[PDB]
From a paper:
Internal thioester bonds are formed between the side chains of Cys and Gln residues, most likely self-generated by a favorable environment during protein folding. This suggests that thioester domains may target distinct receptors and have a widespread but currently unappreciated role in mediating pathogen adhesion to hosts.
Further, we present the identification of host fibrinogen as a covalently bound target of the streptococcal surface protein SfbI. In a thioester-dependent mechanism, SfbI reacts with one specific lysine residue in fibrinogen, forming a very stable intermolecular amide bond. Using a combination of computational, biochemical, structural and cell-based assays we reveal a novel mechanism for host adhesion mediated by a pathogen-encoded covalent interaction.
Residue numbers in the entry: 66 to 270
Write the structure that this text describes.
């Protein structure tokens, strides 16, 4: 089942929402849809802004859909990781992260990682680029969860290795399966600028 919400502003007609219903605050599972249409997977593009509310909340988040590009990725990010002012490289970097992360998993980096953990890994790789999140201690990430029996040692080992592959600057060059001709993602610009702009996990027509 998908929600069907109509925006008060037709310029921002997409509903964005957190579909995670569980008890662990570490997890989110963001989606967008359009007046009851099939839904699409999304990610937070702004680490320092609020995540979309849970589906069916009394407060609803609406969005305008924009084609992804290096320009858009720069403009809608708070602190993007750009080398030598090269927005084409920023575009390539983000596209290759998404293509290799949840759900496309084009080179198997995600294999065996439970969906919510795979989203969490991919989300961290996106923030490495959108917010210049440092990620200098990947071998210790989620150790608190391991110690407390919340994520298995086995899942966390997979997650750490996947994250390292996703943030390698040579990902595009070394991955065997390359992004397809015409590959495109979308930015969702929040109608309420206290909430995150979103990045799709596939093309959203
Ligand atoms: Zn939350
Ligand atoms: Zn490398
Ligand atoms: Zn604005």
């Amino acid at each position: 089942t998908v929600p069907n919400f109509k925006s008060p502003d037709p310029d921002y007609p997409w509903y964005g929402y957190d579909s995670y219903r569980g008890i662990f605050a570490r997890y989110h599972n963001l989606k967008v849809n359009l007046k009851g249409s099939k839904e699409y997977q999304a990610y937070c593009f702004n680490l320092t802004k609020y995540f979309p509310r849970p589906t069916y909340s009394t407060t609803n988040n609406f969005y305008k859909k924009i084609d992804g590009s290096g320009s858009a990725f720069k403009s809608y990010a708070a602190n993007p990781r750009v080398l030598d002012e090269n927005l084409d490289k920023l575009e390539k970097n983000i596209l290759n992260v998404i293509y290799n992360g949840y759900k496309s998993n084009a080179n198997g980096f995600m294999n065996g990682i439970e969906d919510l953990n795979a989203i969490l890994v991919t989300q961290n790789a996106i923030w490495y680029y959108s917010d210049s999140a440092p990620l200098n201690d990947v071998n210790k990430m989620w150790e608190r969860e391991v110690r407390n029996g919340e994520i298995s040692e086995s899942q966390v080992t997979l997650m750490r290795e996947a994250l390292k592959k996703l943030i390698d600057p040579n990902l595009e060059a070394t991955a065997a399966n390359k992004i397809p001709s015409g590959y495109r993602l979308n930015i969702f610009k929040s109608e309420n600028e206290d909430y995150q702009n979103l990045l799709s996990a596939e093309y959203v027509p």
